[PDB]
Amino acid sequence: MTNKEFSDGFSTLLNSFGITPNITLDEYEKSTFLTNAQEQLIIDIYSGRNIIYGKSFEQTEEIRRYLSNLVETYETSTKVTGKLGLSKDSVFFEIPQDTWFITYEVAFLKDSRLGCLDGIEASVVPLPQDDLYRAKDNPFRGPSKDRVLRLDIKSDLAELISKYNVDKYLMRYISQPTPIILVDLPDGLSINGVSTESECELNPVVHRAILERAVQLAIISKTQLT
Amino acid sequence: MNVNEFSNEFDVLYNNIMSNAAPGLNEYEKSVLLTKAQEEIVKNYFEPAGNKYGKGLDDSPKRQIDFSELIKVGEGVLNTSAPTITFDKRAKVYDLPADLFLVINEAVDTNAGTKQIVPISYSDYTRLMSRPYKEPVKYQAWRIITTSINNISVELIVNSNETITDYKVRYIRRPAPIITTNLSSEYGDVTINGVSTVSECELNPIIHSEILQRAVELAKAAYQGDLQASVELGQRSE
């Protein structure tokens, strides 16, 4: 569905300007509620907390077809120099700053010590800080040629603890979806920092579910004190 | 009840039986009062709240027979004779018949079948055109009155890609006046509604007695001539 179709369906479902009591929204309010419904729905889908679906990020074909258009791949070889880490062999990499959740995260290694295995792809294991001390020396869950520990730190950074030098850092995350903005908003206004029209980038399959959730949010907004 | 009897029983009920007889009325005065009573009774009986029963045009057999001899079916003429400015870019202008008192049924015959015309109010127009679709329901059409000169001009709004072939209006004809005698005179021709000749009551004989009674009441109210009578019997003009 397009922005015009989004607005028209929103009005039709809300029974705007009908004879019965009803609710009429501005295009800014329609955009706000559509964006809120979109982001709520995709977060609930990713966490598997939607009772209707009850499935996780890629647990079935339906959810794949829903959130296929947020999956973005990223590559980086630059390392942030001045930072204080929890180990000597700690390197820091920037995050793209539009990430929502990291779903695939792997690290290529370039070191002489692992001879004839150079350029080995290594599995970045997100490790909590409780386990870090007892995982540094762990030969089965600690850093090694086939495994790297990533700890999240401030300023959108990723502290990669490896026994070998880390050359490249690969990611595949869920991106910020573009907001659903149905009209070029006036000066000052914006949704997610976007002022112009913005079409939903997901598939049309989930557009109608987003519309239903946005409508429900609208009625909740108008009918939370009565 | 032809007009000679209208005058004769008007005299009988007005002054011939009074104890202190009032001056007899001229034939022009009787014609004017009878025509006024005719219009007053038509408006009384068309609207339910205008009469004591609370019954309108088709709320009882009597009202049906009352307006039976006044109903007429005519067609609206497409007003492409001259240009004009319609309030709606997609409305076709049609001119209603001249002798139109009240509209009770309208219909339009399109290529996509016949459709009932729903006269939408100025508030319903604003409500409906604020919606995305802005077209009538399946088997109906909308109507709003436009710039009218010498006769009611009408805008018909149908669904897109529909061409109007006929536009029939079932309306209540304007009653002809009740004139007892030829009002032609050497001192000046007077008219009731632009006609001086004898004019019979062209309505069903069922309401002729009511017209006569209302005429007598108007005559006596005029005879008294105080403000109280005029305002009290002016409430029933309606």
From Swiss-Prot, chain A:
Signal peptide: none annotated. It comes from Bacteroides phage crAss001. This is Ring protein 3. The keyword Signal does not apply. Transmembrane segments: none annotated. It is found in: Virion. GO terms for cellular component: virion component. The keyword DNA-binding does not apply. Forms the tail multi-ring barrel with ring protein 1, ring protein 2 and ring protein 4. Homododecamer.
Swiss-Prot record, chain B:
It is found in: Virion. The keyword Transcription regulation does not apply. Keywords: Virion. The keyword Acetylation does not apply. One of its GO terms (cellular component) is virion component. Forms the tail multi-ring barrel with ring protein 1, ring protein 2 and ring protein 3. Homododecamer. The barrel is composed of five stacked dodecameric ring structures. Rings 4 and 5 are both composed of gp34. Podoviridae-like phages usually possess only one such ring. The tail is thus rather long. This is Ring protein 4/5. It comes from Bacteroides phage crAss001.
